[PDB]
Amino acid sequence: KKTSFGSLKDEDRIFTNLYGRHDWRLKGAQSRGDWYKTKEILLKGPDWILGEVKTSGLRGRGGAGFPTGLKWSFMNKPSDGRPKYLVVNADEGEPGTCKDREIIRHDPHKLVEGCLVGGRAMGARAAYIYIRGEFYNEASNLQVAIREAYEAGLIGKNACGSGYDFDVFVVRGAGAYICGEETALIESIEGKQGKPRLKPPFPADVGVFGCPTTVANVETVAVSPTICRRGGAWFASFGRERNSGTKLFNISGHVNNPCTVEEEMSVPLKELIEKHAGGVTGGWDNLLAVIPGGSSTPLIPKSVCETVLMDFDALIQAQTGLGTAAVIVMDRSTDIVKAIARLIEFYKHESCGQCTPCREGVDWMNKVMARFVRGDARPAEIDSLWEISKQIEGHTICALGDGAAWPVQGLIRHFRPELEERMQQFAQQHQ
Amino acid sequence: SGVNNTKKWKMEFDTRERWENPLMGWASTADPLSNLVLTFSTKEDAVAFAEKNGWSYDVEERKVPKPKSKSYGANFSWNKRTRVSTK
Amino acid sequence: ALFVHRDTPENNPETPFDFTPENYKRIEAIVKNYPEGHKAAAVLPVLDLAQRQNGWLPISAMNKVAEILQVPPMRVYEVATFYTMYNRKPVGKYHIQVCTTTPCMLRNSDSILEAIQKKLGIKVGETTPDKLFTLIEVECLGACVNAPMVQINDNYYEDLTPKDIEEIIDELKAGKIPKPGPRSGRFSCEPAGGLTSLTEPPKGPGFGVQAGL
Numbered sequence: 177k178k179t180s181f182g183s184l185k186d187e188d189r190i191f192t193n194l195y196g197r198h199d200w201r202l203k204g205a206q207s208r209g210d211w212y213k214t215k216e217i218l219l220k221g222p223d224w225i226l227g228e229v230k231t232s233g234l235r236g237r238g239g240a241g242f243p244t245g246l247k248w249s250f251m252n253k254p255s256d257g258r259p260k261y262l263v264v265n266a267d268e269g270e271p272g273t274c275k276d277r278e279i280i281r282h283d284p285h286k287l288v289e290g291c292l293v294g295g296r297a298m299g300a301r302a303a304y305i306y307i308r309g310e311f312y313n314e315a316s317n318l319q320v321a322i323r324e325a326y327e328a329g330l331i332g333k334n335a336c337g338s339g340y341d342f343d344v345f346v347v348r349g350a351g352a353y354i355c356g357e358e359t360a361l362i363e364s365i366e367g368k369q370g371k372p373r374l375k376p377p378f379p380a381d382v383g384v385f386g387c388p389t390t391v392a393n394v395e396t397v398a399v400s401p402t403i404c405r406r407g408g409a410w411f412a413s414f415g416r417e418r419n420s421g422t423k424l425f426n427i428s429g430h431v432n433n434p435c436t437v438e439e440e441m442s443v444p445l446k447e448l449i450e451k452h453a454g455g456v457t458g459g460w461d462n463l464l465a466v467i468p469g470g471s472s473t474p475l476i477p478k479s480v481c482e483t484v485l486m487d488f489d490a491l492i493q494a495q496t497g498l499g500t501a502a503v504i505v506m507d508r509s510t511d512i513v514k515a516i517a518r519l520i521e522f523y524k525h526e527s528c529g530q531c532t533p534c535r536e537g538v539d540w541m542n543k544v545m546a547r548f549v550r551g552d553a554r555p556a557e558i559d560s561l562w563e564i565s566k567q568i569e570g571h572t573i574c575a576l577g578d579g580a581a582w583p584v585q586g587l588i589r590h591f592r593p594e595l596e597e598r599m600q601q602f603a604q605q606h607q
Numbered sequence: 608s609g610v611n612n613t614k615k616w617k618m619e620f621d622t623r624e625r626w627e628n629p630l631m632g633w634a635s636t637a638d639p640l641s642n643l644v645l646t647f648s649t650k651e652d653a654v655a656f657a658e659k660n661g662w663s664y665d666v667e668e669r670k671v672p673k674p675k676s677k678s679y680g681a682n683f684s685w686n687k688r689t690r691v692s693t694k
Numbered sequence: 695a696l697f698v699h700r701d702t703p704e705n706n707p708e709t710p711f712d713f714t715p716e717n718y719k720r721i722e723a724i725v726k727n728y729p730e731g732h733k734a735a736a737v738l739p740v741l742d743l744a745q746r747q748n749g750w751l752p753i754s755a756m757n758k759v760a761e762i763l764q765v766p767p768m769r770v771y772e773v774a775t776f777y778t779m780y781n782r783k784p785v786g787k788y789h790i791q792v793c794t795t796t797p798c799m800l801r802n803s804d805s806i807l808e809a810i811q812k813k814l815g816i817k818v819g820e821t822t823p824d825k826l827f828t829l830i831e832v833e834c835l836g837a838c839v840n841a842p843m844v845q846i847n848d849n850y851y852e853d854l855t856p857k858d859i860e861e862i863i864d865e866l867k868a869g870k871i872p873k874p875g876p877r878s879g880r881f882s883c884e885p886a887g888g889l890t891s892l893t894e895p896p897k898g899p900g901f902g903v904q905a906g907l
């Protein structure tokens with residue numbers, strides 16, 4: 177089998193206009209292979225499409241990493257009289273994550289085609305694309321791209337000439353990270369506070385407007401047409417087994433050339449940073465820690481970063497997760513406690529407030545972490561903060577509560593001596 | 608919301624005059640049974656105790672909350688009135 | 695930063711607001727995006743429309759949206775106070791929003807905040823006396839690889855330096871429109887100093903298509 181991963185080739189890159197160097201409107205999208213044989217894909221039936229997605233091994237690119245073909249197949253069932261919908265999650269709110277932004281504005285027709293192909297698989301009559309309200313220009317690009325498809329017969333009535341009616345609506349958010357959560361997104365579309373729903377019922381049973389719904393990430397849906405064209409096996413030939421395909425990576429923070437890039441799954445973390453980002457600032461030896469999958473994932477220290485791979489299973493073993501694959505790099509000049517304290521401050525401002533452990537607990541964690549930054553605490557409080565985070569984790573309605581706890585646990589797990597040192601400095605100064 | 612005080616049967620007696628004490632305004636009574644409350648496992652136990660002691664009595668049948676049909680899903684109904692406008 | 699309303703002379707249920715005829719046609723299109731019987735789904739887009747016409751949301755505007763969509767006013771108030779992009783106080787002509795979450799913090803977004811404060815003579819959360827600029831800190835704006843970045847009204851300005859941000863404020867005071875995007879060499883999110891991928895000509899239609907279509 178393949179034993180090393182990375183060094184992906186342009187011939188095998190899905191998002192070929194990632195950098196906006198080519199025309200983003202329909203004429204460019206067609207010349208690059210979009211909307212080609214879309215009718216054939218639609219006339220092959222949902223069961224064929226879901227099988228292609230099932231065999232590709234695609235896993236959700238929104239953060240949870242749930243296998244996609246299995247998830248989409250929950251909609252594969254007879255209608256009971258309600259309409260069926262595909263909600264596309266373009267909220268892109270996780271700090272460090274900006275991959276969906278490039279897809280929306282530079283490759284909008286891949287998303288629009290993905291909506292139709294995935295919508296056909298689920299039997300949906302329309303797709304609502306929920307895009308965060310701060311992406312006004314990207315949302316206008318998407319509506320322009322959607323208008324071209326409607327004018328080409330590629331969507332709407334008799335889409336592509338397949339006898340299938342599909343609408344693509346774009347609805348904008350109004351400023352809330354919690355509206356990236358699948359059920360909180362649905363409540364936002366319905367015109368409520370973006371507060372998540374409890375499960376059950378699952379969205380495939382009772383979703384937007386109370387109807388069967390599937391929420392899919394923009395990247396998850398944007399690659400779907402290509403997997404159907406080139407086949408699931410082609411996509412599954414990349415990355416480790418169960419970690420298939422090509423992934424978008426955002427390398428930010430203390431790198432020489434922060435960038436977004438498409439790279440094969442299971443690429444080493446070290447290679448990814450050096451190859452595309454130009455390496456850590458001040459040399460690889462100047463690395464302190466990396467947040468590998470967005471703010472919700474725990475950080476890892478330089479020692480783990482040496483050999484860890486970038487895929488779901490590799491990063492779980494390092495006591496973290498792939499998340500959105502947003503790589504935030506911190507060099508040794510970083511005040512690590514301050515950096516993690518700022519993320520807990522972020523979750524504090526983003527918690528919807530609905531449920532007790534996050535409404536009260538995250539704010540409590542923020543107040544403690546602020547004192548840790550200054551050392552105005554006692555070493556016994558470190559174990560108390562670990563216990564508090566475990567009272568939030570797994571007890572909240574939605575996974576924002578877990579995402580607030582994990583960064584705190586990562587800091588305590590790998591940088592406890594730093595925390596104690598700061599308390600030592602504060603105590604001896606006021607002594 | 609706790610229901611732990613609705614488990615057992617109680618026997619109490621009819622309320623009688625309380626009046627204000629002239630010196631202090633305290634609540635005076637001449638009813639020796641004003642505070643007497645007995646606890647019984649079952650209605651039959653309470654009735655039997657009342658009969659042998661010669662007290663006339665009224666028995667009120669136990670009130671049990673109706674069993675309700677709860678469903679979180681109904682809050683988001685496609686076409687029913689149970690759809691909630693807020694959470 | 696209060697989530698209760700107290701009527702004042704310039705913000706009470708009698709404050710004049712109403713959609714223009716042009717906006718009433720846009721509202722009709724918005725409502726048609728949702729199934730009949732679920733008109734409340736239009737609350738967010740219609741509220742945003744009122745703010746685009748008016749610049750902020752007086753309580754009268756919230757009531758007007760409620761009346762149009764036949765939604766209880768409290769359910770509109772709940773939306774208005776939940777989402778952070780809705781302005782319930784008048785803001786400046788240019789709403790500068792500096793991202794300060796960690797990825798932008800790691801690239802010295804603090805210096806950007808200093809440059810804007812020194813140049814405008816105001817503090818975070820304040821508006822200038824001329825009512826041109828209102829400055830706030832925000833959370834991640836989904837442009838972290840282009841940090842430090844700011845949003846002014848609908849536009850993103852990215853890979854900033856204290857000089858670059860100071861120029862943008864000069865362009866706004868003078869009345870000009872500064873073009874959005876990175877102020878460094880690059881055009882978007884590609885690596886600086888040359889692409890590390892996507893350098894070959896894109897493949898054309900039908901490339902690598904599986905047999906059987």
Ligand SMILES: Cc1cc2nc3c(=O)[nH]c(=O)nc-3n(C[C@H](O)[C@H](O)[C@H](O)COP(=O)(O)O)c2cc1C
Nearest residue numbers: 236237238265267268269356357358393396575576
């Ligand atoms: C607080 C929070 C924020 C989230 N934000 C996003 C987001 O911005 N984009 C996204 O695709 N998924 C986001 N998610 C994950 C979604 O809830 C959901 O798992 C995902 O959209 C499903 O799509 P996928 O299966 O294609 O990955 C978020 C989850 C939480 C708990």
Ligand code: SF4
Nearest residue numbers: 528530531534572574
């Ligand atoms: S965990 Fe936080 S964001 Fe999620 S439902 Fe509970 S209070 Fe809201």
Ligand code: FES
Nearest residue numbers: 793798834835838
């Ligand atoms: S951290 Fe500033 S744009 Fe994401």
